[PDB]
Design a protein around this motif. Structure first.
Motif, short mmCIF file in Angstrom:
data_model
loop_
_atom_site.label_atom_id
_atom_site.label_comp_id
_atom_site.label_asym_id
_atom_site.label_seq_id
_atom_site.Cartn_x
_atom_site.Cartn_y
_atom_site.Cartn_z
N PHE A 1 0.84 -1.19 0.00
CA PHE A 1 0.00 0.00 0.00
C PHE A 1 0.88 1.24 0.00
O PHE A 1 2.02 1.21 0.46
CB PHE A 1 -0.96 0.05 1.21
CG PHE A 1 -0.27 0.16 2.54
CD1 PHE A 1 0.09 -0.97 3.25
CD2 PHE A 1 -0.03 1.40 3.11
CE1 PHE A 1 0.70 -0.88 4.48
CE2 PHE A 1 0.59 1.50 4.34
CZ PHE A 1 0.95 0.36 5.03
N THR A 2 0.33 2.33 -0.52
CA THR A 2 1.01 3.62 -0.55
C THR A 2 0.45 4.52 0.54
O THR A 2 -0.76 4.52 0.80
CB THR A 2 0.87 4.29 -1.91
OG1 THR A 2 -0.45 4.86 -2.03
CG2 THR A 2 1.08 3.29 -3.03
N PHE A 3 1.33 5.29 1.18
CA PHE A 3 0.95 6.21 2.26
C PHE A 3 1.48 7.60 1.89
O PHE A 3 2.55 8.01 2.35
CB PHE A 3 1.50 5.71 3.60
CG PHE A 3 1.13 6.57 4.77
CD1 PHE A 3 -0.15 6.52 5.30
CD2 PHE A 3 2.06 7.41 5.36
CE1 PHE A 3 -0.50 7.31 6.39
CE2 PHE A 3 1.72 8.20 6.44
CZ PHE A 3 0.44 8.14 6.96
N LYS A 4 0.73 8.30 1.06
CA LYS A 4 1.08 9.66 0.64
C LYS A 4 0.32 10.70 1.46
O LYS A 4 -0.41 11.54 0.93
CB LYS A 4 0.81 9.83 -0.86
CG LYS A 4 1.35 8.70 -1.72
CD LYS A 4 0.51 8.52 -2.97
CE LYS A 4 1.09 7.44 -3.88
NZ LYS A 4 0.53 7.51 -5.25
N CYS A 5 0.50 10.63 2.78
CA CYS A 5 -0.21 11.54 3.66
C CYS A 5 0.33 12.96 3.53
O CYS A 5 1.51 13.17 3.21
CB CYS A 5 -0.10 11.07 5.11
SG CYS A 5 -1.29 11.85 6.22
N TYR A 6 -0.54 13.94 3.77
CA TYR A 6 -0.20 15.35 3.64
C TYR A 6 -0.48 16.07 4.94
O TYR A 6 -1.57 15.93 5.52
CB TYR A 6 -0.99 16.00 2.50
CG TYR A 6 -0.77 15.38 1.14
CD1 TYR A 6 0.38 15.66 0.41
CD2 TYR A 6 -1.71 14.53 0.58
CE1 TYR A 6 0.59 15.09 -0.83
CE2 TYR A 6 -1.51 13.96 -0.67
CZ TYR A 6 -0.35 14.25 -1.37
OH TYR A 6 -0.15 13.69 -2.61
N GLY A 7 0.50 16.85 5.41
CA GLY A 7 0.31 17.74 6.54
C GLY A 7 0.60 17.15 7.90
O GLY A 7 0.62 17.90 8.88
N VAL A 8 0.83 15.84 8.00
CA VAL A 8 1.08 15.21 9.29
C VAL A 8 1.82 13.90 9.06
O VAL A 8 1.55 13.18 8.10
CB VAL A 8 -0.24 15.01 10.07
CG1 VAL A 8 -1.20 14.10 9.31
CG2 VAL A 8 0.03 14.49 11.48
N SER A 9 2.76 13.60 9.96
CA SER A 9 3.61 12.42 10.00
C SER A 9 2.93 11.29 10.77
O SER A 9 2.24 11.55 11.76
CB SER A 9 4.96 12.74 10.65
OG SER A 9 5.75 11.58 10.79
N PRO A 10 3.10 10.04 10.33
CA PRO A 10 2.46 8.92 11.04
C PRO A 10 2.88 8.79 12.49
O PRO A 10 2.06 8.45 13.35
CB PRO A 10 2.87 7.70 10.21
CG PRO A 10 4.07 8.14 9.43
CD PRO A 10 3.85 9.59 9.15
N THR A 11 4.16 9.05 12.80
CA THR A 11 4.61 8.98 14.19
C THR A 11 3.93 10.04 15.04
O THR A 11 3.45 9.76 16.15
CB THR A 11 6.13 9.13 14.25
OG1 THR A 11 6.51 10.38 13.67
CG2 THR A 11 6.81 8.00 13.50
N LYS A 12 3.85 11.27 14.53
CA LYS A 12 3.11 12.32 15.22
C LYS A 12 1.61 12.21 14.99
O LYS A 12 0.85 12.95 15.62
CB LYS A 12 3.62 13.70 14.80
CG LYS A 12 3.12 14.21 13.46
CD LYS A 12 3.90 15.44 13.05
CE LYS A 12 3.15 16.27 12.02
NZ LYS A 12 2.05 17.06 12.65
N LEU A 13 1.17 11.31 14.11
CA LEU A 13 -0.23 10.90 14.12
C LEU A 13 -0.52 9.99 15.30
O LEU A 13 -1.62 10.02 15.87
CB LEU A 13 -0.59 10.20 12.81
CG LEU A 13 -1.04 11.06 11.64
CD1 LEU A 13 -1.09 10.23 10.37
CD2 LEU A 13 -2.40 11.67 11.93
N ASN A 14 0.45 9.15 15.67
CA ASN A 14 0.26 8.21 16.77
C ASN A 14 0.42 8.87 18.13
O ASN A 14 -0.36 8.59 19.05
CB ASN A 14 1.24 7.04 16.63
CG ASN A 14 0.93 6.16 15.43
OD1 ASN A 14 -0.23 5.85 15.16
ND2 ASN A 14 1.97 5.74 14.72
N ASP A 15 1.42 9.75 18.29
CA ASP A 15 1.71 10.29 19.61
C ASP A 15 0.58 11.18 20.12
O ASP A 15 0.11 11.03 21.25
CB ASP A 15 3.05 11.03 19.61
CG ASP A 15 3.06 12.26 18.72
OD1 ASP A 15 2.02 12.59 18.12
OD2 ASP A 15 4.13 12.91 18.62
#
Lengths: 50, 50
Positions: A26-40
């Motif tokens: 799968f592709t994760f082309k998220c915009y405006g926020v990082s997955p690690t700082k999505l989790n924290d």
């Protein structure tokens, strides 16, 4: 895609590690926020499209 | 596209510190060390000013 369903998720906890650790192609082309700082930290009013 | 920017990294920068290393950041638990859509993605992106 013409009638893309909108799904709202609320009153729970949304763990993103399940998506990261499954179906590896799968592709994760998220915009405006990082997955690690999505989790924290977190947010509200989860909206999911398909 | 000559201008590039980094949005993905393990830790924050100390004040007046420059980071030039280009090492792919691994969102997943396993450090696959290989370019892909999600796993071991390239850390810094490039803009497309027009």
């Amino acid at each position: 895609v013409y009638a893309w369903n909108r799904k709202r998720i609320s009153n729970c906890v949304a763990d993103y590690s399940v998506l990261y650790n499954l179906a590896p192609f799968f592709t994760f082309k998220c915009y405006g926020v990082s997955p690690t700082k999505l989790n924290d930290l977190c947010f509200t009013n989860v909206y999911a499209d398909s | 596209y000559n201008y590039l920017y980094r949005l993905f990294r393990k830790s924050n920068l100390k004040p007046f510190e420059r980071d030039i290393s280009t090492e792919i950041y691994q969102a997943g638990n396993k450090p696959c060390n290989g370019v892909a859509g999600f796993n071991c993605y390239f850390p810094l992106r490039s803009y497309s000013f027009r």
